[PDB]
Curated annotation (Swiss-Prot), chain A:
Part of a large, functionally divergent protein family. Was initially predicted to have chloromuconate cycloisomerase activity, based on sequence similarity. Protein modeling and substrate docking was used to predict the substrate specificity, prior to biochemical analysis. GO terms for biological process: amino acid catabolic process; peptide metabolic process. Belongs to the mandelate racemase/muconate lactonizing enzyme family. It comes from Methylococcus capsulatus (strain ATCC 33009 / NCIMB 11132 / Bath). This is L-Lys-D/L-Arg epimerase. Catalyzes the epimerization of L-Lys-L-Arg to L-Lys-D-Arg. Can also catalyze the epimerization of other cationic dipeptides, such as L-Arg-L-Arg, L-Lys-L-Lys and L-Lys-L-His, but with lower efficiency (in vitro). Pfam families: MR_MLE_C (PF13378), MR_MLE_N (PF02746). Coiled coil: none annotated. Keywords: Isomerase, Magnesium, Metal-binding. SMART domains: MR_MLE (SM00922). Substrate binds at T126, K151, V152, K153, K257, D287, D310, L311, D312. Binds 1 Mg(2+) ion per subunit. InterPro entries: Dipeptide_epimerase (IPR034603), Enolase-like_C_sf (IPR036849), Enolase-like_N (IPR029017), Enolase_C-like (IPR029065), Mandel_Rmase/mucon_lact_enz_CS (IPR018110), Mandelate_racemase_C (IPR013342), Mandelate_racemase_N_dom (IPR013341).
UniProtKB/Swiss-Prot annotation, chain B:
Keywords: Isomerase, Magnesium, Metal-binding. Its EC number is 5.1.1.-. This is L-Lys-D/L-Arg epimerase. Coiled coil: none annotated. GO terms for molecular function: magnesium ion binding; racemase and epimerase activity; racemase and epimerase activity, acting on amino acids and derivatives. CDD domains: L-Ala-DL-Glu_epimerase. Mg(2+) binds at D180, E206, D231. Catalyzes the epimerization of L-Lys-L-Arg to L-Lys-D-Arg. Can also catalyze the epimerization of other cationic dipeptides, such as L-Arg-L-Arg, L-Lys-L-Lys and L-Lys-L-His, but with lower efficiency (in vitro). Belongs to the mandelate racemase/muconate lactonizing enzyme family.
Length: 346, 344
């Protein structure tokens, strides 16, 4: 099955709460199948801007891909890594469209051909940095919507962070678990205090407390604490995965985002490393169309090591370019029974 | 594509006294046939022919019946869970399933695996034996078109070193040599061997030290470690991870399907190796062309593959299949047929 055509466009998705941009990718085969992909580059984490992403997705720059056989997909992905080495979000949009196509070609949901390890998982929704009152309010809104897991961003100001966490813990009254994301904002003593609190409050783990290039700060922690820490901005691709997993392992949880690693194929390499090293998998996202969320979910549901999801990147989108691909019920995400990514597109 | 049937049988292959293989036939409902072969090596993996046979018994495979081949990664994980102590049996089933999936897609297996190579030369082996027989066998392999010789070493340095010197002189550049002491060297002896190996342009030294002795490897200078390959020390992805982790124990991983349990775990080993910058070598046991072909497809699909010792079917006086690979001028390649490309 030959790739007949590749088209990219910019989409402006207003937020329900401001807008956010995604590159939308259509790959068509000669028999008329359509694979779908979406790119949401994060320049501060990967260096990849929207301009560079868009440029790497140019139809003519992608000429090497035209006419190629999708049945060769792992070779294709190896070429995506070689020919778009600086544009991981673009790479992911193409990679996910190609997997969509291969799964449609085999007539099954993608997770089925990746091989299924899980039926569904709870996803977190995010409460950003704000005061106690707004935090508790959001918490109750989410609880009402059926969510059992909250992800709270922390700013690194301890009195405030800790207060928000205590009050949130009291309000929730065991109705949902909490996980936190300081995103690089903590120092070493501060992290020790935060971890004491986290133990106290039953918070599940701490994501990326330290600067991305600070992994030595992580390794200097007691193993019991490292096990409770997730790598996000420190983990882009398989190379990072291997360096972090190598004894002494820097942490106990890997946060994989397609827009960091560059697609499902590199994601499988990370999963291989994590699983051998006994590291749990978290699957996150940028602000994303339901297309790439769906892709991420198929991959996650196909990894035995997957323990957690922050998959909420399409929830704040006022409009999207596709429906389906995943079903949300009672705070849990699962895929549908349709082939490929299982997206409905006009 | 659903699995309709699975059959196992024991073949006794006279050499040119005898080696046994288990042959697996997997049939789907649409009439397709995948093939696999098992050659367990007990001193390496602990797996006996009896245990392998028992693991492959049709009455123990009911969980595989009716299963969809398009779900292959899931089937392979279950293979790992259900046959943890029988890697050769696991590999026979795994390669048969890969054969089937590649037929489903209508291409040579290597192509759906992502081809990274068209062909590579394979070594052929010269066993432990006196200088003259060594040289004579060397001339015999050269006349069949082989450019690479794999020489087994016994750990007696006088005999080993003289054999290698005379062989080097006799070859006069016509073939490269790699060596396999298989656990028989001590630390100092290995230093002497490495000096000689540099002198004679020998490619690398496979598994000089006991399998449980990888600390002895890590104690060596990095430049020496780079010239050493792990074999009996390397079974599956866990081993590969522990050998690759800094400081890395050696520069070359020898994957054998009868050690790691199939193409799937072989793929995991390859991921680890590529990330760590370690080269891949694909070896074998005494094996039907079926599993040689399987290994070759997998090898030609890994960017990290630098070497093959794929000669395990050459000495079989008969075999149960043809094709699956072509040997020309000492180099192995696959055919243009779908699946393993075997003629049955
Ligand atoms: Mg994060
Ligand atoms: Mg060996």
């Amino acid at each position: 099955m030959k790739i007949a055509d590749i088209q990219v466009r910019t989409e402006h998705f207003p937020l329900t709460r401001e807008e956010i941009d995604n590159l939308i990718v259509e790959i068509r085969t000669a028999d008329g199948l359509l694979g779908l992909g979406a790119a949401s580059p994060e320049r501060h984490v990967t260096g990849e801007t929207l301009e560079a992403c868009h440029a790497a997705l140019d139809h003519d720059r992608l000429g090497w891909l035209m006419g190629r056989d999708i049945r060769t997909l792992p070779r294709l992905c190896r070429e995506l890594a070689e020919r778009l080495p600086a544009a991981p979000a673009a790479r992911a949009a193409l990679d996910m469209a190609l997997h969509d196509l291969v799964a449609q070609c085999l007539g099954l949901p993608l997770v089925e051909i990746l091989g299924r390890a899980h039926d569904s998982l709870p996803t977190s929704v995010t409460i950003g940095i704000k005061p106690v009152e707004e935090t508790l309010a959001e918490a109750r809104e989410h609880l009402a919507l059926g969510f059992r897991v909250l992800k709270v961003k922390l700013c690194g100001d301890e009195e405030q962070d800790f207060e928000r966490l205590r009050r949130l813990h009291e309000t929730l009254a065991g109705r949902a678990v909490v996980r936190v994301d300081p995103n690089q904002s903590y120092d070493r003593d501060g992290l020790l205090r935060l971890d004491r609190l986290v133990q106290e409050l039953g918070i599940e783990f701490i994501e990326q407390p330290f600067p991305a290039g600070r992994t030595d700060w992580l390794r200097a922690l007691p193993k019991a604490i490292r096990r409770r820490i997730a790598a996000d901005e420190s983990l882009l691709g398989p190379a990072d995965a291997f360096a972090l997993a190598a004894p002494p392992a820097a942490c106990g949880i890997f946060n994989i985002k397609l827009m960091k690693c560059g697609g499902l194929a590199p994601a499988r390499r990370i999963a291989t490393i994590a699983e051998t090293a006994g590291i749990d998998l978290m699957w996150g996202c940028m602000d994303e169309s339901r297309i790439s969320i769906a892709a991420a979910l198929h991959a996650a549901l196909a990894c035995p090591a997957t323990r957690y999801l922050d998959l909420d990147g399409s929830f704040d989108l006022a409009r999207d370019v596709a429906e389906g691909g995943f079903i949300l019920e009672d705070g849990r995400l699962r895929v549908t029974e349709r082939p490929g990514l299982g997206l409905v597109y006009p």
